[PDB]
């Protein structure tokens with residue numbers, strides 16, 4: 405038998421088969437209803453007759469009726485499998501409410517009739533995909549950012565930090581900046597154009613002030629992008645002002661510490677005797693960690709916060725848009741993991757609360 409791995413994010417579903425090197429299906433975590441439903445790309449295509457909703461909000465499932473539709477679409481339309489034939493590994497956000505873990509479990513067993521299931525913490529899987537069982541993950545997607553310190557294979561929940569700022573906020577900030585300059589981006593469709601601009605042209609400045617001065621004094625940082633309507637937008641300092649928000653959340657009116665500060669704060673909540681190992685094993689995960697320059701910037705910023713002699717290493721895998729999924733693919737493949745699945749037999753005996761005993 406082959407296990408399935410489903411990694412449900414705020415913006416994108418990543419799904420596939422355990423042992424594969426990448427998710428076979430990657431599509432928007434969007435459900436559209438009329439007035440029975442459409443999912444993902446098809447929903448965006450018919451946005452004019454549908455109300456488009458994201459069932460996961462800052463990494464937490466909030467619309468359960470729509471979430472069930474995403475799962476159904478994943479199994480039957482994208483993967484084209486019979487879920488009753490496959491153990492299924494799902495993922496969850498750090499600090500996911502217990503009730504939600506139970507609900508995921510109930511749905512998978514009673515609606516989809518999976519033979520076995522497990523729910524793993526996303527950041528933990530990313531660490532595994534880097535070949536590590538100890539380290540600190542910065543996981544930043546479309547909806548939420550977490551710092552998750554992990555020791556001997558398990559997250560340290562009391563030291564987890566959360567920032568409700570991630571890729572969609574960065575897209576929205578870029579939309580705002582560009583709209584102010586006279587290129588109106590407001591609709592959901594226009595958001596997808598600006599998302600593309602962000603992904604292609606933005607980067608993290610090593611020294612934000614220095615970069616601002618460079619952009620003020622030359623055209624060396626300008627890049628152009630042709631819109632669907634044929635307008636050519638040129639941006640310079642917007643390229644690095646947009647992701648600077650991760651380090652300076654006040655750019656969008658948030659009072660939160662930036663991601664370097666949250667990384668440091670998380671390390672300082674951990675056992676003093678493991679901090680050295682965390683500093684030497686900072687792993688970046690998620691689409692919002694893809695900006696050029698981000699690892700060098702984080703290296704600089706953590707170096708300024710940490711003790712002077714501390715060895716600091718930032719690991720930024722090329723495949724890190726999919727590190728969570730890949731870590732799942734690895735885990736669900738292992739012989740040592742097969743006794744860890746929750747079986748339907750165990751579920752039929754114990755009910756949804758078995759998830760708390762079997763999954764952490």
Ligand SMILES: CO[C@@H](C[C@@H]1OC(=O)C[C@@H](O)C[C@H](O)CC(=O)[C@H](C)[C@H](OC)c2coc(n2)-c2coc(n2)-c2coc(n2)/C=C/CC[C@H]1C)[C@@H](C)CCC(=O)[C@H](C)[C@@H](C/C=C/N(C)CO)OC
Pocket residue numbers: 422423424425426524525528531532533534535536537556557558559723730733734735737738740741764
């Ligand atoms: C970090 O150790 C992992 C296991 C070893 O795998 C690795 O080290 C992964 C590296 O090889 C990745 C590399 O650095 C980069 C990579 O290899 C790349 C990312 C590469 O890109 C092309 C890639 C993409 O997909 C894959 N590789 C892929 C998919 O399947 C596999 N690889 C695969 C399936 O089986 C294996 N590999 C087995 C590998 C042997 C080593 C494992 C014992 C890890 C999953 C082990 C986890 C544990 O032991 C847990 C503590 C224990 C209990 C569970 C605890 N929790 C769930 C806690 O929350 O698990 C049973």
Ligand SMILES: Nc1ncnc2c1ncn2[C@@H]1O[C@H](COP(=O)(O)OP(=O)(O)OP(=O)(O)O)[C@@H](O)[C@H]1O
Pocket residue numbers: 412413414415416417462463544545546547548549570571572599602603604689690691692693694695725
């Ligand atoms: N090259 C890139 N540069 C900047 N951002 C990128 C890049 N590639 C993808 N992104 C952003 O990454 C986000 C998607 O990342 P990912 O799939 O990790 O998030 P998710 O799992 O859907 O959300 P979350 O983990 O927040 O629930 C989107 O905001 C997307 O625009």
Ligand SMILES: OC[C@H]1O[C@@](CO)(O[C@H]2O[C@H](CO)[C@@H](O)[C@H](O)[C@H]2O)[C@@H](O)[C@@H]1O
Pocket residue numbers: 606607608609610615624625696697
């Ligand atoms: O600087 C970080 C990172 O951004 C990239 C573009 O992705 O380069 C930008 O920044 C450089 C430093 O100012 C500029 O020289 C370059 O022209 C600009 O695009 C990456 O090359 C770099 O790693």
Ligand SMILES: [Ca+2]
Pocket residue numbers: 412413414526545690728
């Ligand atoms: Ca995610």
